[PDB]
Amino acid sequence: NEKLAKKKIVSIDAGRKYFSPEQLKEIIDKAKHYGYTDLHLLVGNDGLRFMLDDMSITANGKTYASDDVKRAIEKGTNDYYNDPNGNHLTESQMTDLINYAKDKGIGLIPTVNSPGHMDAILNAMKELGIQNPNFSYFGKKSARTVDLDNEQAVAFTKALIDKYAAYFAKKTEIFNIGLDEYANDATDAKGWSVLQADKYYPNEGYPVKGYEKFIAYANDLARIVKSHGLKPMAFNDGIYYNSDTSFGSFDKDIIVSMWTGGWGGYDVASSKLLAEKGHQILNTNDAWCYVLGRNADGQGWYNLDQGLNGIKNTPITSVPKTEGADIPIIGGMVAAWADTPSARYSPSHLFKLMRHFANANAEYFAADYESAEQALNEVPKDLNRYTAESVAAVKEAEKAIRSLDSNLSRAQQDTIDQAIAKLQETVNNLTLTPEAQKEEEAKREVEKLA
Numbered sequence: 288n289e290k291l292a293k294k295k296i297v298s299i300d301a302g303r304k305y306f307s308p309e310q311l312k313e314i315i316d317k318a319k320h321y322g323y324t325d326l327h328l329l330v331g332n333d334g335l336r337f338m339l340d341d342m343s344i345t346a347n348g349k350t351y352a353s354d355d356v357k358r359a360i361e362k363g364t365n366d367y368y369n370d371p372n373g374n375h376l377t378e379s380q381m382t383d384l385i386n387y388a389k390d391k392g393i394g395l396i397p398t399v400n401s402p403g404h405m406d407a408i409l410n411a412m413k414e415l416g417i418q419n420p421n422f423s424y425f426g427k428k429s430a431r432t433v434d435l436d437n438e439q440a441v442a443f444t445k446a447l448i449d450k451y452a453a454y455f456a457k458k459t460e461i462f463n464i465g466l467d468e469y470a471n472d473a474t475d476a477k478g479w480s481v482l483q484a485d486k487y488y489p490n491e492g493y494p495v496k497g498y499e500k501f502i503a504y505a506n507d508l509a510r511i512v513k514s515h516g517l518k519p520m521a522f523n524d525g526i527y528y529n530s531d532t533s534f535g536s537f538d539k540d541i542i543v544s545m546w547t548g549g550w551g552g553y554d555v556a557s558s559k560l561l562a563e564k565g566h567q568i569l570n571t572n573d574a575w576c577y578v579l580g581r582n583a584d585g586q587g588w589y590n591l592d593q594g595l596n597g598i599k600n601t602p603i604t605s606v607p608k609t610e611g612a613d614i615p616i617i618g619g620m621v622a623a624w625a626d627t628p629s630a631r632y633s634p635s636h637l638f639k640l641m642r643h644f645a646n647a648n649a650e651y652f653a654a655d656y657e658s659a660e661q662a663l664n665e666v667p668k669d670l671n672r673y674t675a676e677s678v679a680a681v682k683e684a685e686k687a688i689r690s691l692d693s694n695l696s697r698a699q700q701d702t703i704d705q706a707i708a709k710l711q712e713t714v715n716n717l718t719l720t721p722e723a724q725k726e727e728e729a730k731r732e733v734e735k736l737a
């Protein structure tokens with residue numbers, strides 16, 4: 288009940304890798320069937336694979352024509368990965384997809400990642416004449432991250448997010464700004480420490496007020512998302528990294544997708560700290576997580592068997608790095624990633640992961656009422672042909688279906704299935720009146736004269 292009110296989300300990496308509208312509709316059908324509430328669609332994540340009809344941008348006193356932005360982005364994406372299946376979703380396809388999901392009671396949550404995982408936008412910005420948009424660390428240039436000290440590149444990124452946010456306004460509820468790295472490829476995976484370093488180790492060439500600037504950046508993206516009536520979300524990585532609250536405060540309306548509890552040399556804030564600060568927590572435990580193409584034990588980290596085992600061993604309420612506290616959650620999210628985007632997407636592998644997550648946490652997931660609705664529509668129309676006793680039993684069985692609690696969980700699916708089987712039995716039991724019997728035999732007789 289309070290369990291049923293939680294979000295249950297599947298995440299799909301359609302930033303690195305192309306997914307067709309047909310493929311996503313199939314994912315949505317499964318999400319509805321298994322009792323999920325939302326599809327989390329990354330469209331900006333290395334690649335940028337969603338294109339508005341109007342891509343014109345004004346940023347920091349400069350104007351960029353819609354057609355030039357489209358060309359620049361399309362090519363920037365292909366420079367990351369030129370996917371044989373496609374390049375991007377169009378605005379018509381996205382609007383249709385969102386409507387499709389909405390008719391099935393399923394929400395859509397887009398991600399456009401920054402300041403990291405934004406290769407395609409960085410490439411596009413170069414083509415559009417913005418100089419040095421990428422962060423560089425003592426001569427090593429990030430392929431994925433924007434330099435927060437480059438005002439023009441920051442202004443362009445923000446203007447692009449604002450344009451996506453304008454489109455998603457009213458059609459969606461939540462917008463994921465990501466915030467999940469800062470130049471890990473250029474700093475030996477220590478981007479957050481690099482941003483914090485100059486405060487504790489001055490005059491050594493570390494980015495001046497780096498982490499302070501990241502906070503302002505996060506907060507301004509949150510302001511932008513909210514100005515469009517949407518809720519901002521981000522991954523947990525950089526939010527009070529090293530539990531350091533001394534650089535400033537993150538906007539507490541930022542919903543945190545808590546995917547990692549960190550590891551040796553990667554010291555993220557505990558979910559305990561984030562919850563105490565007042566951030567809502569979406570449990571996105573990487574115990575559940577799955578990388579396309581890594582389909583069985585032995586094929587590397589986050590293979591499908593590993594994800595399945597994680598789902599068995601880590602319930603939806605089990606959040607990374609709790610430090611022993613009871614962490615309240617708004618929901619849970621299982622994630623499929625496309626780290627090697629040329630890997631073949633296998634729908635059946637994904638659905639297995641989704642089904643197991645639903646089954647392991649059945650009291651949280653919605654029951655499936657679709658077969659019940661179908662059973663009702665399939666009751667014969669011509670009931671006057673049948674015995675009063677047999678018709679009354681059918682009517683009773685229909686009523687029992689219509690009076691089922693509309694808020695059953697997946698754990699209570701049997702209740703619905705028994706009502707369906709009972710209706711079918713009563714329909715099977717429909718018995719012709721003597722008058723209908725005579726008419727039917729008269730009709731078989733003429734039909735034989737053919």
Ligand SMILES: CC(=O)N[C@@H]1[C@@H](O)[C@H](O)[C@@H](CO)O[C@H]1O
Nearest residue numbers: 467468524546578589624625626
């Ligand atoms: C911030 C971060 O590194 N997120 C990573 C994502 O980019 C990657 O696709 C996935 C599987 O390897 O692990 C995620 O959580």
